[PDB]
Symmetry: C2
Subunit: 49 residues, 2 copies
DNA sequence: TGGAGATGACGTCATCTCC
DNA sequence: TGGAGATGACGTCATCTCC
């Protein structure tokens, strides 16, 4: 059927978006963990001086 | 068939783990964004004083 | 070992959303 | 509006992994 054919592609596009969103999110946690470390270290330094 | 029955449940358990992992990850980004803000603000303060 | 479970992509159905 | 697309869960098959 036709509605099925269209839905099969809509599902394909939807899955693809969910896979990129996950990766995007995983990268962000990596980015924030590093930014966090530099600030935490920075705080210790300024605290001393 | 039997192997199919088992796989149908293995898939159910697997999906469940992927849903919790996503949520866990989403919470972490929220947590780090806030911790980041407090440190960034903290740095500005110590910088001044 | 061979064999069990885990997991990625698939296509489908049910629903929601949005004009 | 009614109708189009988006999306969550499903069950299946193919493969990987791990003893």
């Amino acid at each position: 059927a036709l509605k099925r054919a269209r839905n099969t592609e809509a599902a394909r596009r939807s899955r693809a978006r969910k896979l990129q969103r996950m990766k995007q999110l995983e990268d962000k946690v990596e980015e924030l963990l590093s930014k966090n470390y530099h600030l935490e270290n920075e705080v210790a330094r300024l605290k001393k001086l």
